[PDB]
Structure formats: structure tokens, C-alpha cells
């Protein structure tokens, strides 16, 4: 409900992409349900797979092998890089930047290639499963990941150059969407939504 272009009331209508995932999981075995979690958040598939695997392992009272755990943490951080690339670049594109999107999506393609080499699926791999990881890293993947990581910082710096200090970008975002820390906590916000307000909470540190 807009008076002019001012939003008097914003009412989100959802369910346009409700596929009954939770109902379907009940009809599937634990392994069969694993691919569902990849689809829940298309941008961050492996992290959802890891969350499901952790839940199933805790119920199973079984411990993943250490190399499996380190592979999970590594690919989770790669998934975080993908997710944040998508979020920041699509946010800029919606506010009109439209170049960092392509710039960073090239790197997203490279990280997809890492996904494909490990699993054979560029996205939605079933790599992380309860009890560990399906297959060991193909030989040569780690050095390629090193090659990518050594250069990724320059790309992030160029994106900052495009957006961080721009007058227009700062105007579009500097004081929009302010959320109080207490309001953020009560409303159930998590992650950067809480940390942006100044609350110091990251489950990776508080609850590794």
C-alpha cells in the first residue's frame, strides 16, 4: 500500500514456491531426503546438506571422520563465498549497479567447477551426507582451489571499489532498513541481520 511512492504497508505473500518439501521428506529415507536440502537454498546448497548431515549424525550417535569434517568446512566456506557473491551482486543489480554481477559470477562459475569436480553437479551436489562426504577430493582439486583463492581477494577489492565508497550507493543504503538490536532479536533475525545491528553472535564461534 503506497501513498505516493512511500510504502504505508508492506504485506509479503509467500507460498508461490511451496513444494511440500517437509511432507515429502516423511515418505523418503534419510539418504533420499538429503537432495531436498540442496534445493531449499539454491545458492548455499552444501551448507544445508551439512546441517541435515549434522542433525542425522547427532541422532545416529555417529561421528564424521576428521578429513570429512575438514572437507565439509572448506566447501561450506566456498558455499558462503558463492552465497555472498550472489547476495551482494544481485542487491547491487536491483539497485542498479549491474557490473559486479558479471564480474563476480565468473568466479561463481569457477567455484561451481570445484563443485562439479567433487560431485559431478555444478550445484545441488549430494556431497555432504550423514556420516561424512560421499567421495574423496579428486587429485589436484586443492591446488586449483589455492589458485582461485590467491586471486579472489583482488576481485572482492574491485567490487568494493565499485560500490563501497560510491556516493550513490551509500545514499541508497546508508540509513535504510535500520533495525534495533532488541527488535532484531525478538523478530527472530539471524546472521548478518543480527550482527549488522551490533549483536555479537556467530554460531561458528559461539557453537562450533
Amino acid at each position: 500500500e503506497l501513498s505516493g511512492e512511500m510504502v504505508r504497508k508492506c504485506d509479503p505473500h509467500i507460498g508461490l514456491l511451496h513444494r511440500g518439501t517437509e511432507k515429502l521428506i516423511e515418505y523418503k529415507t534419510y539418504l533420499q531426503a538429503l537432495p531436498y536440502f540442496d534445493r531449499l537454498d539454491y545458492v548455499s546448497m552444501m551448507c544445508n546438506e551439512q546441517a541435515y548431515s549434522l542433525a542425522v549424525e547427532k541422532l545416529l550417535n555417529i561421528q564424521p571422520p576428521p578429513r570429512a569434517q575438514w572437507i565439509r568446512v572448506l566447501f561450506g566456506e566456498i558455499t558462503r563465498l558463492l552465497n555472498h557473491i550472489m547476495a551482494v551482486t544481485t542487491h547491487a543489480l536491483d539497485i542498479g549497479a549491474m557490473t559486479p554481477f558479471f564480474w563476480m559470477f565468473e568466479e561463481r562459475e569457477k567455484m561451481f567447477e570445484f563443485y562439479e569436480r567433487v560431485s559431478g553437479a555444478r550445484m545441488h551436489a549430494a556431497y555432504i551426507r550423514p556420516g561424512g562426504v560421499h567421495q574423496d577430493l579428486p587429485l589436484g582439486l586443492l591446488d586449483d582451489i589455492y589458485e582461485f583463492s590467491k586471486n579472489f581477494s583482488f576481485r572482492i577489492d574491485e567490487l568494493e571499489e565499485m560500490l563501497t565508497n560510491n556516493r550513490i550507493w551509500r545514499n541508497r543504503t546508508v540509513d535504510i532498513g535500520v533495525v534495533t538490536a532488541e527488535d532484531a532479536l525478538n523478530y527472530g533475525f539471524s546472521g548478518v541481520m543480527l550482527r549488522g545491528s551490533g549483536i555479537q553472535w556467530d554460531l561458528r564461534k559461539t557453537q562450533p
Binding site: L17, R19, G20, L24, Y42, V43, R108
Partner: protein
């Protein structure tokens, strides 16, 4: 016949214009949209082929149904397809769009976008790789190249 030759050449020109300039509408439902963006990304840039994403349905020529089509979203998809001017072509991307895929037996999923809107090219995969989507788009371009509207007009 000279008339047949003129009709064939004009049909060639029209089909070339339509296939060379294919403007998909900015319609992405689900994970398959991400592979579509990667197709728009530099590696497989679709702008080289003349495929430019245009938001307005009336300024678009192709609808790519990327992602699962829920029963809630189906009327909006049909509305967007109808509001799209013709000639209009529909490409169904991903198993979810093609036949329902992982959520085929869900209450809230349409078991294929063919039920709601006519589909020209089906791109298999879940998610289909960006190269697969580009292959499907080029296949649609060849399908347009094979069209014989003016020849049929002359023969009718």
C-alpha cells in the same frame, strides 16, 4: 514459382530476425534460475547470441520456466504468458518445470508447465547446466529457422 521464391525469402528474413533477437522475460521461479543467470554471466554470455533479458512481458519474446511451478504461481505464469505478444515461445528448464521433478507427487506442485502453458523446448536436468540451457535456446532458434508461416500462407 517466383511468388514462392519471394515468400520463402521473406520468411527467411522474418525467421532470421526473430531467432537472432530472442528476448527472454525475467522470469525465474526456482534454483534453475541461477543457472540461467550463469548463462547470462560472461562465460556463456547469451547477449552474444542476441538473447537479452527484458522484464516487461509485452517487450519479451520467450518465457523460460526455470523452477518448480506451484499451484499458487500457475495463474500468474499463465497471465504473464498471455500478456506476452506473439510470436511467443516457451522453454521449460529443469525437471521441476518439465514434469514436476523432485516434487512431482506434492499437493502444491503442477506436474509440468505443459499443463498450464504450451512448451516448445524442454531442457532436461536438475538443475540444467548453463551450457544445456544455451543448447536449448539455440535449438529453439533452429526451430524458428524451420518455420514456414509465409510459405503456408501462399500455399493456403
Amino acid at each position: 514459382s517466383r511468388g514462392e521464391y519471394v515468400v520463402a525469402k521473406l520468411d527467411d528474413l522474418v525467421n532470421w530476425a526473430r531467432r537472432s533477437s530472442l528476448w527472454p522475460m525475467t522470469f525465474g521461479l526456482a534454483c534453475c534460475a541461477v543457472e540461467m543467470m550463469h548463462m547470462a554471466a560472461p562465460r556463456y554470455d547469451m547477449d552474444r547470441f542476441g538473447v537479452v533479458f527484458r522484464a516487461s512481458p509485452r517487450q519479451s519474446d520467450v518465457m523460460i520456466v526455470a523452477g518448480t511451478l506451484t499451484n499458487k504461481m500457475a495463474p500468474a505464469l499463465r497471465k504473464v504468458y498471455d500478456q506476452m505478444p506473439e510470436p511467443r515461445y516457451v522453454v521449460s528448464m529443469g525437471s521441476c518445470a518439465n514434469g514436476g521433478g523432485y516434487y512431482h507427487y506434492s499437493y502444491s506442485v503442477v506436474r509440468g508447465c505443459d499443463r498450464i502453458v504450451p512448451v516448445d523446448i524442454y531442457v532436461p536436468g536438475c538443475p540444467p547446466t548453463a551450457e544445456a540451457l544455451l543448447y536449448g535456446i539455440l535449438q529453439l532458434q533452429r526451430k524458428i529457422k524451420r518455420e514456414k508461416r509465409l510459405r503456408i500462407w501462399y500455399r493456403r
